Amino acid sequence: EDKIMSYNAFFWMWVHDMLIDSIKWRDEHGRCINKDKGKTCIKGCNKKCISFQKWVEQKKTEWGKIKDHFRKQKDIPKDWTHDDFLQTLLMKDLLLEIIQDTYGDANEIKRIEALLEQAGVGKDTTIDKLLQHEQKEADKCLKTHTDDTCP
Amino acid sequence: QKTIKKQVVLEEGTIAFKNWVKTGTEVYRQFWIFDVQNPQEVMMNSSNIQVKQRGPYTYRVRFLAKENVTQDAEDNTVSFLQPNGAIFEPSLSVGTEADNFTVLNLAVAAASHIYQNQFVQMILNSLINKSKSSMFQVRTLRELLWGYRDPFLSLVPYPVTTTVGLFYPYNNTADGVYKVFNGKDNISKVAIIDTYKGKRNLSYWESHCDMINGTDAASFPPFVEKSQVLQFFSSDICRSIYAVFESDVNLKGIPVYRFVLPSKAFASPVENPDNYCFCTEKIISKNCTSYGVLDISKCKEGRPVYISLPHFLYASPDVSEPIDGLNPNEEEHRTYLDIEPITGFTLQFAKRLQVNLLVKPSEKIQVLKNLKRNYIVPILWLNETGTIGDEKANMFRSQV
Ligand SMILES: *[C@@H]1O[C@H](CO)[C@@H](O[C@@H]2O[C@H](CO)[C@@H](O[C@H]3O[C@H](CO)[C@@H](O)[C@H](O)[C@@H]3O)[C@H](O)[C@H]2NC(C)=O)[C@H](O)[C@H]1NC(C)=O
Ligand SMILES: CCCCCCCCCCCCCCCC(=O)O
Ligand SMILES: CCCCCCCCCCCCCCCC(=O)O
Ligand SMILES: *[C@@H]1O[C@H](CO)[C@@H](O)[C@H](O)[C@H]1NC(C)=O
Ligand SMILES: *[C@@H]1O[C@H](CO)[C@@H](O)[C@H](O)[C@H]1NC(C)=O
Ligand SMILES: *[C@@H]1O[C@H](CO)[C@@H](O)[C@H](O)[C@H]1NC(C)=O
Ligand SMILES: *[C@@H]1O[C@H](CO)[C@@H](O)[C@H](O)[C@H]1NC(C)=O
Ligand SMILES: *[C@@H]1O[C@H](CO)[C@@H](O)[C@H](O)[C@H]1NC(C)=O
Ligand SMILES: *[C@@H]1O[C@H](CO)[C@@H](O)[C@H](O)[C@H]1NC(C)=O
Ligand SMILES: *[C@@H]1O[C@H](CO)[C@@H](O)[C@H](O)[C@H]1NC(C)=O
Ligand SMILES: *[C@@H]1O[C@H](CO)[C@@H](O)[C@H](O)[C@H]1NC(C)=O
């Protein structure tokens, strides 16, 4: 019901930090987490595919709780649902505008736009589409990096 | 007195009935637009609004006869719808309906006022910027007055009315249903409104401020005294108000009483304690101490419309504080009705009102982010006036 800060402040901070964390998985463990067609198992990557898989489920659960408080707003426009509201708010072009206006970092926007483009974005919103994509990448990660010491 | 008590009743064949269905007086509505001289200085630096008045832009109004006239023999009431129409008089105007003015961007001020939810303000900001809308805009007279499709509102993904305009809609509309006493059973009740849209109260205001009192001000019950307070309902300001005796006047040989709209009607509960229920909030009104303005947002679908007198006559100095270029004058900007005391008929009047919109700063809407104060922005002011025709004036003193 209340977060560390105002719901509006928390909402955008969480969205921003999850998008950043999604990028940081590649910046830190891209030898494991990538879209490279060549499926060769790298030593020590299995462990990292599991942590990345764990993170996806943690964010999916956190997101569910955030969507639940959004649906409790009593000042939303008349004849419009909380879900159409959420969906409009998280459409790629508006999402990137709000993040940039709040953080003022254009390069961070470039990285996010690239991440969303490669996710097929660029269970209903952008965040949901991305968390679904993340679940498929962590599953692909485990199918390639099946063992910490390949084979 | 005897011939009066019968020719004043609102029923078929009387002098009051013919003049009631369709007036013998030509009514004009002259507009003056407040043309914004420093839109960028206001928007960027939160400076005072430099205005220049442009006008008159004159329209012939109230030329249409009353419609769906239906007498009720039971309660001695007569019902109607008053159709609305405006015909431009290029002959009586300073310019064309095509004249351009820099004016407050109406949709931006209203949407920012109405939608306070910060997630909504974030969608709206994006939409205001994509349509390259700003705090001010350039509109023709025809658009500002009667309506335009707003490019920002046209993008709003939830249901909104995308046409904006100060008097939108006007043509092809009708104000009613008004139910008035015909005065058959008691002449002291002729033309006083029984109901308007089936109610005795507007549901706009709380307590006594919500009451629909008096006539429509086109006539009042006969045998008017100088000690009398004349009550009347004006749907354009969304409340009942009153007029009070000023002076004796001779109109084309007809001795009439000049009734005026007193400054007290506009006073705060500090000067006038009865006006408490016309104070809508405690911030803009500075704890209900500001005066000369009326927040009519409840009857304008939440839009921050503020009615005042032209050039903020009879208004608090804080209301006039952020505007440069106004010159109030009691004689010039007041409202008055010249009433013939025997019949109770209004033979001449001048109804002078100013239309304003409140605009506040915003954290999320960039175009209002630099504002350092709230502004009650004067949009235009009008003089709706009519005088008895020479022929009708000579027919009056002869037939009455
Ligand atoms: C509707 O109300 C208008 C505002 O009161 C009114 O216009 C004003 O009319 C007076 C004349 O009656 C003008 O004042 C004149 O005063 C001196 C003395 O003659 C002259 O030196 C001035 O130049 C001026 O002519 C006001 O200036 C004028 N105000 C504006 C802003 O136009 C209308 O005439 C009224 N409408 C009708 C049709 O009655
Ligand atoms: C004669 C007195 C009545 C005055 C009424 C003036 C009406 C002004 C309204 C301007 C439209 C503003 C934009 C609407 C946007 C929205 O409602 O969301
Ligand atoms: C015979 C023609 C009759 C038409 C008379 C119409 C008179 C209406 C008077 C209403 C005045 C009140 C509204 C103005 C208030 C203001 O100045 O803010
Ligand atoms: C705003 O103020 C600055 C001075 O502080 C001035 O240079 C600038 O011209 C002003 N802006 C406008 C649009 O008048
Ligand atoms: C008024 O009269 C017309 C006559 O054609 C009728 O059809 C209409 O319903 C009436 N108007 C209203 C709004 O009641
Ligand atoms: C309103 O109707 C009159 C008469 O038909 C016409 O002159 C005027 O242009 C119309 N106004 C608008 C805004 O269409
Ligand atoms: C108002 O501006 C528009 C657009 O520039 C123009 O077409 C129109 O002619 C202007 N009005 C007048 C009276 O010139
Ligand atoms: C006539 O009506 C008025 C109110 O409008 C009332 O005060 C008065 O008593 C009535 N007169 C009679 C004779 O009923
Ligand atoms: C109108 O409102 C007042 C409250 O101030 C009340 O006394 C009156 O009875 C109401 N009128 C009707 C007919 O409901
Ligand atoms: C309406 O008339 C009643 C009775 O005189 C009065 O108490 C009330 O204040 C009036 N209301 C308005 C808004 O003028
Ligand atoms: C001013 O507002 C406060 C509450 O915020 C209240 O105590 C005070 O009496 C108000 N003053 C007047 C005269 O309305």
Residue numbers in the entry:
A (entry chain B): 576 to 697, 716 to 744
B (entry chain A): 35 to 434
Q: What does the publication say?
A:
Unlike other human-infective Plasmodium species, this parasite contains a set of adhesive proteins, the PfEMP1, which are expressed on the surfaces of infected red blood cells, causing them to bind to blood vessels and tissues. To mediate endothelial binding, PfEMP1 proteins contain large extracellular ectodomains consisting of 2–10 copies of two domain types, the Duffy-binding like (DBL) and cysteine-rich interdomain region (CIDR) domains. The scavenger receptor, CD36 binds to many classes of CIDRα domain (CIDRα2-6)2223 and is the host receptor most commonly found to interact with parasite isolates from patients and with laboratory-adapted parasite strains27. CD36 is a cell surface scavenger receptor that plays a role in fatty acid uptake, angiogenesis and phagocytosis.
We coexpressed the ectodomain of CD36 (residues 35–439) together with the MCvar1 CIDRα2.8 domain (residues 576–745 with a C626S mutation to remove an unpaired cysteine). The CD36:CIDRα2.8 complex was subjected to crystallization trials with in situ deglycosylation and proteolysis, allowing a complete data set to be collected to 2.07 Å resolution. The CD36 ectodomain adopts an architecture similar to LIMP-2, with an elongated structure, and is decorated with nine N-linked glycans distributed across the protein surface. While LIMP-2 undergoes a pH-dependent conformational change, with an ‘open' conformation at pH 5.5 and a ‘closed' conformation at pH 7.5, CD36, which was crystallized at pH 8.0, adopts an open conformation. Unlike in LIMP-2, the cavity of CD36 contains two electron density features that resemble the extended hydrocarbon chain of a fatty acid. We therefore modelled palmitic acid into these electron densities and observed a close fit. The PfEMP1 CIDRα2.8 domain therefore binds to the α-helical bundle at the membrane-distal tip of CD36, close to the major entrance (entrance 1) to the hydrophobic cavity and in the region identified previously. The majority of the interaction is mediated by F153 from CD36, which fits into a hydrophobic pocket on the CIDRα2.8 domain surface. Secondary interactions are made by a smaller α-helix (residues 668–678) from the CIDRα2.8 domain (mediating hydrogen bonding to CD36 through E672) and a loop (residues 647–656; again hydrogen bonding, this time through D650). In the structure presented here, the MCvar1 CDRα2.8 domain (crystallized at pH 8.0) adopts the typical compact configuration found in other CIDR domains crystallized around physiological pH, and aligns to the CIDRα1 and γ domains with rmsd of 3.4 and 4.3 Å respectively.
